[PDB]
Design a protein around this ligand. Structure first.
Ligand SMILES: NS(=O)(=O)c1ccc2c(c1)C1=C(CCC1)[C@@H](c1ccc(O)cc1)N2
Ligand SMILES: NS(=O)(=O)c1ccc2c(c1)C1=C(CCC1)[C@H](c1ccc(O)cc1)N2
Ligand SMILES: [Zn+2]
Length: 257
């Protein structure tokens, strides 16, 4: 099925997922000069002190760190959001080289990687119901640049050897996602979509302006993962990013002057 190869990559996805050519697709280029400051936007409230991580899974496209979302433990509120959004998982997108890997771009700049913290709107009861609604999900996007190591990423990096291939999982309890945030919560926001099939138009995107720094060694270990299953020919899990999509009839708002 779909993937990131020449034969099944983003240019092909519209054949099985025609919303790929829809009116609110993600990611987008964030033109920093055209984004408007919206003084009515609230600070973001990221409340992760009671987060319960469970497991890490190689799903053949990325790796997901999954959370217990059966209670209001790790939630996102405020900013552009109405109501309470519960953390269900995070994952990354990254490149084969440090000059590419992010999904969103900033004045056409590509970062080495992008973190997505995925949350669903509790008014819809479960994630599967939320993805059917225009305000179902809130994804917090954070850029990664290569420089100093990110201490709070190292526990993720060190478990990757145990989930090398598609379908492998590992216990991943007691991980604190607060260690993946930058200092500032300044953000851009716009209405968009999932960046992988099914490409549902259910996401409020909140993209932080400040990148986090990770080391060359940390991102090298992302690049040792495999898209393939065990006992299949090795295809390195790299360049698992969708390129920027047309902005169409959308405005990107900034939380900051
Ligand atoms: N790169 S991203 O952060 O935009 C992203 C992409 C795909 C995803 C997810 C997050 C999580 C689910 C939907 C919401 C969040 C999952 C899915 C959705 C519905 C579905 O029927 C199958 C799987 N897929
Ligand atoms: N619109 S879509 O992106 O979902 C899509 C695109 C290309 C495809 C397929 C579906 C599927 C293949 C076999 C099963 C499903 C195949 C393929 C090509 C190359 C490849 O590496 C793997 C599979 N042709
Ligand atoms: Zn993503």
């Amino acid at each position: 099925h779909w993937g990131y190869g020449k034969h099944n990559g983003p240019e092909h996805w519209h054949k099985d997922f025609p919303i790929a050519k829809g009116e609110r697709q993600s990611p987008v280029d964030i033109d920093t000069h055209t984004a408007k400051y919206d003084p009515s936007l609230k600070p973001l409230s990221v409340s992760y002190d009671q987060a319960t991580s469970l497991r890490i899974l190689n799903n053949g496209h990325a790796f997901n760190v999954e959370f217990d979302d059966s209670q209001d433990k790790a939630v996102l509120k405020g900013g552009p959001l109405d109501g309470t959004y519960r953390l269900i998982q995070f994952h990354f997108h990254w490149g084969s080289l440090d000059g590419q890997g992010s999904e969103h771009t900033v004045d056409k700049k590509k970062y080495a990687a992008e973190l997505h913290l995925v949350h669903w709107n509790t008014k819809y009861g479960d994630f599967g119901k939320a993805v059917q609604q225009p305000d179902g999900l809130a994804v917090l996007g954070i850029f990664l640049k290569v420089g100093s190591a990110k201490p709070g990423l190292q526990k993720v990096v060190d478990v990757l050897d145990s989930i090398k291939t598609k379908g492998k999982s590992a216990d991943f309890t007691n991980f604190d996602p607060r260690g993946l945030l930058p200092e500032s919560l300044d953000y851009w926001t716009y209405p968009g979509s999932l960046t992988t099939p099914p490409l549902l138009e259910c996401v409020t995107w909140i993209v932080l302006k400040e990148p986090i720094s990770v080391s060359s060694e940390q991102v090298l270990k992302f690049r040792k993962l495999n898209f393939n299953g065990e006992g299949e020919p090795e295809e390195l899990m790299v360049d698992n990013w969708r390129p920027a999509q047309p902005l169409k009839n959308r405005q990107i708002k900034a939380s900051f002057k």
